[PDB]
Structure 1
Amino acid sequence: NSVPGAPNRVSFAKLREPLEVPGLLDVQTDSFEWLIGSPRWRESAAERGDVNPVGGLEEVLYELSPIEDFSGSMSLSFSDPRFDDVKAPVDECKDKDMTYAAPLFVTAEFINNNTGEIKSQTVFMGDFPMMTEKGTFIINGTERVVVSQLVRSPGVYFDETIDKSTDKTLHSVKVIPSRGAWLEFDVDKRDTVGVRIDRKRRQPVTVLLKALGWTSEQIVERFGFSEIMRSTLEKDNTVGTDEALLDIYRKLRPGEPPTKESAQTLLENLFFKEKRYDLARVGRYKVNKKLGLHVGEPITSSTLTEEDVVATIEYLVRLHEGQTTMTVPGGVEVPVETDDIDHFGNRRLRTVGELIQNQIRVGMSRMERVVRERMTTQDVEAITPQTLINIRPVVAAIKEFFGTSQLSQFMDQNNPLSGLTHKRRLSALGPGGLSRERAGLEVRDVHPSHYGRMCPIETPEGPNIGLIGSLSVYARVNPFGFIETPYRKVVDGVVSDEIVYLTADEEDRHVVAQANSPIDADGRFVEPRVLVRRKAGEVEYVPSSEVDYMDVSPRQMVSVATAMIPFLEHDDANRALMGANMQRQAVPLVRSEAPLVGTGMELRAAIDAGDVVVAEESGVIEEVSADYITVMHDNGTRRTYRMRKFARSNHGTCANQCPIVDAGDRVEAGQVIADGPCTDDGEMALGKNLLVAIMPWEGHNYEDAIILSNRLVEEDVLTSIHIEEHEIDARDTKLGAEEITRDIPNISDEVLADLDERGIVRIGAEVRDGDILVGKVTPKGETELTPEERLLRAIFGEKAREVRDTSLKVPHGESGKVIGIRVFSREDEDELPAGVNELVRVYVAQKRKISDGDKLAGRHGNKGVIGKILPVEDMPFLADGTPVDIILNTHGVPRRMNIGQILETHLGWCAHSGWKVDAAKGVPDWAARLPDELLEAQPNAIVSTPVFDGAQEAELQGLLSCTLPNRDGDVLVDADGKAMLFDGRSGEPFPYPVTVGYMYIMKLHHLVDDKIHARSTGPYSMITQQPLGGKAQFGGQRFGEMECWAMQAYGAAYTLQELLTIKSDDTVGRVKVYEAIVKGENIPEPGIPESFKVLLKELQSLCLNVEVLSS
């Protein structure tokens, strides 16, 4: 419910849930709004921390201003960031290739100190890119999304190691800041606590304390129990604060003549002045929590401090001593224990707001540097802030972050699910994050702190396994960047309805219950012993009195894409991973009917994906058509919504938007008003419902091969629309100017039939591989011709035709109609790149059918290519003559541990046929816990089994028992769930029953037409003379080292010589072999490879005399 136009999808959920699914795009929207300073974020923060609501831009300007000279006789300040209206709408930007942006305005104030003068000016910072209603950015027309990054929060981190030789514990600590230097206080094999600073290991803690100013008496007083530190004091062999500072300087600063005043300020600059050592607000908060300095002080003064350093040293020494709790003098007591990097109490989430804020800061640093540089050179009293400020570094930093940065990813859109799951994506790799080569196996693990904060299932299965994750459905992001998780607090065994958000630290501190705990429908637990997660991730049985927290609802630990998988709890983990990752590659079909059996996370996922038009204000439908909807609001005003008819997605898929309301209907604000690419009646639909058999059929469905009925081809059950675009620019040249015209040199009038008068093809004119799309000619220049060419030209009377033909030809292996032509020009004043006079885009769309080799997959990761499409007649059919549509293999089910597909098949058959529980004498025992309005269902009714609380196996058996007949008196499916199929090829019935049902399968984006490739002779590389690679160019297959090894091991020589010499590199050999093949002569002997010649030249260029000798 809670959606006005929600289709009635009956649910199998046993227990109610108190908390609804939050806004799935909050992680992006709230972050960017906090960056901006929007009133929505401002009032939210006022509700939750009104102490200091500061936006990202405000924080940057406040920490920058004021800017002083060395003399400090004059200053400049920034204040009051304020945005302007967007320069162009979203659709116009996407069409004309602009960037969705808005101007930035600030109030710069220039202040003189000696004389006294204020200069307030309105300064235009730059065109700030903006985030749309769907949480995505538009850069140069295309849509981009910046993924949140998982980085370890700065602070203190203690660990212990074993030396494995003397077998004694060696503790350590890393005070890792942001924008600063490192420093570690380890414990050695001996008892000399080292103070390695900036990777310079020497100089025990006594010298550091003396440099800070601590005398030996103070050191002993503060650390009396420390036998290790008293020993270091005894063997300090260095006395005197100035002597310690001298040692500090000679150690950390080799090659510089030390002085008694440079050393006195070097430590302060390195660790106490915020200019060069500024651990962020998160770092300060983490340090304060770890040591317990200030419990109520508002956070500020982000630089380190001597009390923090001495607290860290004392923490290290007490941890080595083996204490359990610590009390800093003047601070609360805090437990002492090692810290884990993989714990989500330390891995903060740097979202889009913080990423863009960091780029803004690094740009404004350059701007302030330029301001300071020009601020002294230019004469005083003659400058204004407009002359002072340079905004080019800031805008350049923004642009160079948005483009060419692997955290600003090309927003893949194969379906609304793909878009939604590309948002809410947590990537651990990126600038400032760990790379794949340095990514050890330790980080690619599901730490027990991930429960409810990151999906343990959904993650890429390739080389990026474990480095990329997605947020959970109920997860929320802390302002610092930690990931919160809602919980219902239970008090003295009374499960309350108050929801409290906890992070990893709080969850570890407290004791959490289980989501499916058997409550007594009153607040109490029926059984005192309940399942519990402990601090270390331990799972135990605990009396109900000690439990103080409980999960909001089941399926909280799982992400959206994985929550869309029915019967998940019966699947394995690897196959659930595959299904979750392969649910996001489904292509949009032309009908997109809703799935029969699914979960409750389809309607919410579809309407929160932003690819479905939804009425913002209630009213009555006035006018409805295939292009627009006019909703007549309750009060006078009207509003028109423009559908997107056949718009090209970023990955070449259809993006149709069909209305689902009539001319007299009334719609309430929030109702789905128009379908999307992969939607049906508002909810989600990634595929179709197909009749399913589990028998192995004549070896065509062998080893994950799939057989399809021809009915899918005939009725276009699985038929996708793909739109490809072609771009050709008629640009200026040195020898003249290229023009787009019909007159193409050395061409016939046959290929020009489809071309209009201005050169481009007609709209709706079909095209074939090798046709002409745009006729462009380039000035060829003056070139000498062969005498045979001269003789032919003289014979035929044809002229020189001094321009060259370079026309936009549709590449190899494409067909389909032409939808629309968008042509730009310089004469009509369009924003074109310099040097380009004419640009034209041609959109070609094809209606690809289903065919052998295409990849099909269910929702449980049972993938497989289409082996053979049989005709309708020769497919197994039930007793009533209905033929099955798909034929899986039985051998692939058990060894992959994914009987979730079998359960889904059974439930789908039950839903399609319709059932009726016969409660003539009481409700049957198996259906005792079944909810109401589920004992009987109409044929082709939809059901909804949630993720971890769904239909039970006993309930499935009971439903299969009552399977009311189709049209006559006939129950085609027995109690076991099988059926009597007849062989449509031979005729005799199959000797044993075979499972049948309605599984939900999807057409993946791995089509054959995008994969098939061939090459005989194409373009060649530049430095080496080997052929190119990839389907984009012509390219040839790579004959790798392993293939060479196999070729050698086969006892084979001549094939290897052929593939390595006269097929790849022999420049004077390829032409000879082609000529010999054409003329029918023997293949000539090969020559030495041009690659080997290049290697010889390189060796000679490396001052290595290499000479090849005959004898």
Structure 2
Amino acid sequence: SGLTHKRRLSALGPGGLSRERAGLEVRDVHPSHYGRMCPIETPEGPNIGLIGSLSVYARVNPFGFIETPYRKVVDGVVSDEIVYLTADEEDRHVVAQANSPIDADGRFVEPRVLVRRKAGEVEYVPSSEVDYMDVSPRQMVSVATAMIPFLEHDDANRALMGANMQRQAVPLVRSEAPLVGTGMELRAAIDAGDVVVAEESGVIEEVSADYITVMHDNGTRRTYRMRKFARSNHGTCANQCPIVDAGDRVEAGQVIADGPCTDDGEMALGKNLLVAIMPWEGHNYEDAIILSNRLVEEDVLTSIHIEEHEIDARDTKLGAEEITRDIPNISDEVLADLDERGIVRIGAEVRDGDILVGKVTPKGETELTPEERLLRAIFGEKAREVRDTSLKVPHGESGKVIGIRVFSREDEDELPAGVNELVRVYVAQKRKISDGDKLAGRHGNKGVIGKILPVEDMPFLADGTPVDIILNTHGVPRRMNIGQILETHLGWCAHSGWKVDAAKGVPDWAARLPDELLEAQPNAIVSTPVFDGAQEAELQGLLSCTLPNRDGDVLVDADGKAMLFDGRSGEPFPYPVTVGYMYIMKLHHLVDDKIHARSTGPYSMITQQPLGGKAQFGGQRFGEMECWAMQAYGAAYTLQELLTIKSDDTVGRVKVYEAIVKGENIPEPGIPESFKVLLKELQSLCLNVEVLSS
């Protein structure tokens, strides 16, 4: 997400077109975007086509036109000299296609070559008018779209959703590398910048969890610090931990320390989870997902989130605010974790309502009611002339206190005008996976978690291994994203390993397989690039020849399907079920950040309606279409109490609250406040609006 927020070509801004007045002509894919923009990766909201992203190989002219490289082919011989051509020259010439049979020196093989002509048309031109060729396939795609395996089997809408959800993943605590990926993972990690890279070669002298000091080849030494548990912009964690030993030898450019979402150098946004593609008892109905309890027990999908809270003590008119533990009228027991000078001690667990910074503002002397005067005279306390406005941790938050960063005026810090002291408190919590949290794959198959079963009532294999997620099978065929099925099959092959029996020669599916893909150990990481990947025939062969687990037992037969038992009723399932290893990632649409509720909170200023948003308490909006639905039902009293004694009847809200608390009957509503505001505006526009009686 950090990398793809740069390399973004937003078409809207000062000097560009707006959002409401943008025509549908400018939002389309012109045929001159081949290698200068990505047709896939756009935001799927109301910004389709107005925000794109640069291609992988593209550059920028001195003037601002987006170039792209091409190989120059001279008289039917493809050379190696690379010419950067912008869109005008690409329209002038005729450009070949990247996956065409070069004859080992530069010559084409077949006498007719698929090309790309001037007006975006595609023709069949003989192999002598061809004068340019692409550098590689996947020249059109972006960075984020280059990390989807089997992209050419997905549909374009699901590829768009996959490329947009790949940059919403959260950094887990373990960060395991994917079992089947593409090649654009190491480069996209060391170029993102969140990986410490050695500058010059040397030998490691000392590794701690805070620094590595390489001893260079000429005397000098250099110590790289680490960012340990530093908050990011969006509230996640930015931990960095070394991956070298205390005696190693490194070269220049070598990865020396991981990042948030990396594993031994390369990008890793999620975990490998054993999947089944059956429908299971309605808990995975319409894109819901059932997990296992093993992912909560073993802390597989567990992330760390860090908040911050800020209060500041300025000097108001009646005096100066004071940060101290001498709070006005309050119990002693809530002042347990607070230190001698206000702020909480480091390590103290907090909860929604606790005191973070004790600040008390001067109030002065106002009018007191006779009842409170009588109570003060009964119990002997004084007026307590200062008013408590402390900093309290908001609703729903908890977790340890990591650090307190306190500035001050007396240390000559550049606080703004009026602020005498500013203090920031960091509260971090470790969130496990739970129902309501949102998971996703790479090929655009998202979905909330419906139920976390225990580990014993999950469909287990014949060996004894329980599966870990269960994806529904009605969402695969009608959405055209069988990249997930091919990734599942190749994930099982790469997990269990293989050995193609080349005794009586190499078999004819593997005639064009490379060497040392004829055999592989278990947990072998493979890689299929984007538009030049593993074919269906190669997948069928590798599925047919794997190697057994520990005993003589091939758990998955030639179709990719296994004979699952049922962990709840006991009997085996009547038909075999597709299993395999799928790489799913946890998305940042968590259930703890979305839930809010409100009975009575803050109200607005001009009109007396409730506020809106989870940052406040905030009420829900009951608009025109819901009013039409209520009128279509015929509920008049529900509509009247939704529009009067819940929003605007200022003398009615207190009466309905005291009637609910005393247990009485709800009173009849009155005229809402916004209507009287309307009448005052209409009278102020020199119109004589008068309400008659009879």
Q: 2-side partners of 1:682 and 1:521: how far apart? A: 34
Once the 2 structures are TM-superposed, how far is the Cα of residue 529 of structure 1 from its aligned partner? 1.1
Paired residues for 1:349-428 under 5 Å: 418-428=1-11
Once the 2 structures are TM-superposed, how far is the Cα of residue 702 of structure 1 from its aligned partner? 0.5
Give per-residue Cα distances to partners, 1:557-585, cap 9 Å, x unaligned: 00000001100000000000000000000
Give per-residue Cα distances to partners, 1:988-1025, cap 9 Å, x unaligned: 11111111111111100000000000000000000000
- For 1:977, the equivalent position in structure 2 comes to 560
Once the 2 structures are TM-superposed, how far is the Cα of residue 464 of structure 1 from its aligned partner? 0.5
Give per-residue Cα distances to partners, 1:66-119, cap 9 Å, x unaligned: xxxxxxxxxxxxxxxxxxxxxxxxxxxxxxxxxxxxxxxxxxxxxxxxxxxxxx
Once the 2 structures are TM-superposed, how far is the Cα of residue 738 of structure 1 from its aligned partner? 0.3
Once the 2 structures are TM-superposed, how far is the Cα of residue 522 of structure 1 from its aligned partner? 1.9
Once the 2 structures are TM-superposed, how far is the Cα of residue 889 of structure 1 from its aligned partner? 0.2
Paired residues for 1:1017-1036 under 5 Å: 1017-1036=600-619
SS in 2 for 1:1001: strand
Paired residues for 1:105-504 under 5 Å: 418-504=1-87
Q: 1-side partners of 2:138 and 2:104: how far apart? A: 20
Q: 1-side partners of 2:285 and 2:221: how far apart? A: 59
SS in 1 for 2:499: coil
- For 2:653, the equivalent position in structure 1 comes to 1070
Once the 2 structures are TM-superposed, how far is the Cα of residue 519 of structure 1 from its aligned partner? 1.2
Q: 2-side partners of 1:931 and 1:1042: how far apart? A: 62
Q: Does 1:1090 align with 2:657?
A: no
Once the 2 structures are TM-superposed, how far is the Cα of residue 726 of structure 1 from its aligned partner? 0.4
Where in structure 1 do 4 or more consecutive aligned residues deviate above 6 Å?
none
Give per-residue Cα distances to partners, 1:581-637, cap 9 Å, x unaligned: 000000000000000001000000010000000000110000101011101111100
Once the 2 structures are TM-superposed, how far is the Cα of residue 470 of structure 1 from its aligned partner? 0.3
SS in 2 for 1:751: helix
Give per-residue Cα distances to partners, 1:246-270, cap 9 Å, x unaligned: xxxxxxxxxxxxxxxxxxxxxxxxx
Q: Which one is further off, 964-973 or 782-791?
A: 782-791
Q: 2-side partners of 1:465 and 1:820: how far apart? A: 42
Q: 2-side partners of 1:1088 and 1:986: how far apart? A: 62
Once the 2 structures are TM-superposed, how far is the Cα of residue 794 of structure 1 from its aligned partner? 1.4
Q: 1-side partners of 2:568 and 2:654: how far apart? A: 53
Q: 2-side partners of 1:787 and 1:488: how far apart? A: 92
Q: 1-side partners of 2:45 and 2:680: how far apart? A: 39
Once the 2 structures are TM-superposed, how far is the Cα of residue 437 of structure 1 from its aligned partner? 1.0
Give per-residue Cα distances to partners, 1:431-466, cap 9 Å, x unaligned: 000001111000000100000000000000000011
Q: 2-side partners of 1:419 and 1:522: how far apart? A: 41
Q: 2-side partners of 1:483 and 1:427: how far apart? A: 14
Once the 2 structures are TM-superposed, how far is the Cα of residue 786 of structure 1 from its aligned partner? 1.3
- For 2:205, the equivalent position in structure 1 comes to 622
Q: 1-side partners of 2:647 and 2:114: how far apart? A: 66
Q: 2-side partners of 1:831 and 1:595: how far apart? A: 47
Q: 1-side partners of 2:216 and 2:110: how far apart? A: 54
Identity fraction in percent:
100
Decide which of 107, 111, 121 is 1:524's aligned counterpart.
Answer: 107
Q: 2-side partners of 1:435 and 1:863: how far apart? A: 31
Give per-residue Cα distances to partners, 1:121-163, cap 9 Å, x unaligned: xxxxxxxxxxxxxxxxxxxxxxxxxxxxxxxxxxxxxxxxxxx
Paired residues for 1:889-900 under 5 Å: 889-900=472-483
Once the 2 structures are TM-superposed, how far is the Cα of residue 796 of structure 1 from its aligned partner? 1.4
Q: 2-side partners of 1:524 and 1:986: how far apart? A: 65
Q: 2-side partners of 1:532 and 1:795: how far apart? A: 97
SS in 2 for 1:792: helix
- For 2:577, the equivalent position in structure 1 comes to 994
Give per-residue Cα distances to partners, 1:706-762, cap 9 Å, x unaligned: 110010001111001000000100111000000100011111111100100110001
- For 1:1041, the equivalent position in structure 2 comes to 624
- For 1:509, the equivalent position in structure 2 comes to 92
Once the 2 structures are TM-superposed, how far is the Cα of residue 521 of structure 1 from its aligned partner? 1.9
Once the 2 structures are TM-superposed, how far is the Cα of residue 471 of structure 1 from its aligned partner? 0.3
Once the 2 structures are TM-superposed, how far is the Cα of residue 520 of structure 1 from its aligned partner? 1.6
SS in 1 for 2:88: helix
Decide which of 925, 931, 937 is 2:508's aligned counterpart.
Answer: 925
- For 1:856, the equivalent position in structure 2 comes to 439
- For 1:688, the equivalent position in structure 2 comes to 271
Once the 2 structures are TM-superposed, how far is the Cα of residue 474 of structure 1 from its aligned partner? 0.3
Q: 1-side partners of 2:120 and 2:50: how far apart? A: 21
Give per-residue Cα distances to partners, 1:533-557, cap 9 Å, x unaligned: 1111101111111110011011000
SS in 2 for 1:421: helix
Once the 2 structures are TM-superposed, how far is the Cα of residue 963 of structure 1 from its aligned partner? 1.3
SS in 1 for 2:492: helix
Once the 2 structures are TM-superposed, how far is the Cα of residue 422 of structure 1 from its aligned partner? 0.2
Q: 2-side partners of 1:649 and 1:941: how far apart? A: 33
Q: TM-score, normalised by structure 1?
A: 0.62
Q: 1-side partners of 2:104 and 2:559: how far apart? A: 35
Once the 2 structures are TM-superposed, how far is the Cα of residue 797 of structure 1 from its aligned partner? 1.4
Give per-residue Cα distances to partners, 1:400-441, cap 9 Å, x unaligned: xxxxxxxxxxxxxxxxxx000000010000000000111100
Q: List gaps (5 residues or longer) in structure 1.
A: 1-417
Q: 2-side partners of 1:768 and 1:521: how far apart? A: 69
Once the 2 structures are TM-superposed, how far is the Cα of residue 790 of structure 1 from its aligned partner? 1.1
Q: 2-side partners of 1:969 and 1:952: how far apart? A: 29
Q: TM-score, normalised by structure 2?
A: 1.00
Q: 1-side partners of 2:526 and 2:381: how far apart? A: 74
- For 1:222, the equivalent position in structure 2 comes to none
Q: 2-side partners of 1:1043 and 1:600: how far apart? A: 51
Q: 1-side partners of 2:298 and 2:75: how far apart? A: 62
Once the 2 structures are TM-superposed, how far is the Cα of residue 798 of structure 1 from its aligned partner? 1.3
- For 1:633, the equivalent position in structure 2 comes to 216
SS in 2 for 1:955: helix
Give per-residue Cα distances to partners, 1:170-200, cap 9 Å, x unaligned: xxxxxxxxxxxxxxxxxxxxxxxxxxxxxxx
Once the 2 structures are TM-superposed, how far is the Cα of residue 923 of structure 1 from its aligned partner? 0.4
Once the 2 structures are TM-superposed, how far is the Cα of residue 793 of structure 1 from its aligned partner? 1.2
Q: 1-side partners of 2:248 and 2:545: how far apart? A: 38
Q: 2-side partners of 1:521 and 1:1036: how far apart? A: 70
SS in 1 for 2:306: strand
Q: 2-side partners of 1:435 and 1:696: how far apart? A: 45
Once the 2 structures are TM-superposed, how far is the Cα of residue 792 of structure 1 from its aligned partner? 1.2
- For 1:148, the equivalent position in structure 2 comes to none
Once the 2 structures are TM-superposed, how far is the Cα of residue 1104 of structure 1 from its aligned partner? 1.1
Give per-residue Cα distances to partners, 1:830-880, cap 9 Å, x unaligned: 111111000000000000000001110000010000000000001111111
Q: 1-side partners of 2:647 and 2:349: how far apart? A: 37
Once the 2 structures are TM-superposed, how far is the Cα of residue 531 of structure 1 from its aligned partner? 1.1
- For 2:121, the equivalent position in structure 1 comes to 538
Once the 2 structures are TM-superposed, how far is the Cα of residue 694 of structure 1 from its aligned partner? 0.3
Q: 1-side partners of 2:304 and 2:642: how far apart? A: 40
Q: 1-side partners of 2:110 and 2:363: how far apart? A: 89
Once the 2 structures are TM-superposed, how far is the Cα of residue 782 of structure 1 from its aligned partner? 1.7
Once the 2 structures are TM-superposed, how far is the Cα of residue 490 of structure 1 from its aligned partner? 0.7
Once the 2 structures are TM-superposed, how far is the Cα of residue 788 of structure 1 from its aligned partner? 1.2
Once the 2 structures are TM-superposed, how far is the Cα of residue 785 of structure 1 from its aligned partner? 1.3
SS in 2 for 1:520: coil
Once the 2 structures are TM-superposed, how far is the Cα of residue 780 of structure 1 from its aligned partner? 1.1
Q: 1-side partners of 2:366 and 2:557: how far apart? A: 82
SS in 2 for 1:427: coil
SS in 1 for 2:580: strand
Q: 2-side partners of 1:1068 and 1:618: how far apart? A: 76
Give per-residue Cα distances to partners, 1:464-500, cap 9 Å, x unaligned: 0110000000000011000000000111111111110
Give per-residue Cα distances to partners, 1:338-363, cap 9 Å, x unaligned: xxxxxxxxxxxxxxxxxxxxxxxxxx
Once the 2 structures are TM-superposed, how far is the Cα of residue 664 of structure 1 from its aligned partner? 0.7
SS in 2 for 1:1083: coil
SS in 2 for 1:476: coil
Once the 2 structures are TM-superposed, how far is the Cα of residue 932 of structure 1 from its aligned partner? 0.8
Once the 2 structures are TM-superposed, how far is the Cα of residue 528 of structure 1 from its aligned partner? 1.3
> Which structure would you say has the larger RCO, counting Cα contacts within 8 Å and 6 or more residues apart?
2
Mark the structure with the bigger radius of gyration: 1
Q: 2-side partners of 1:795 and 1:562: how far apart? A: 74
Q: Report which of the two has the higher share of helix.
A: 1
SS in 2 for 1:737: coil
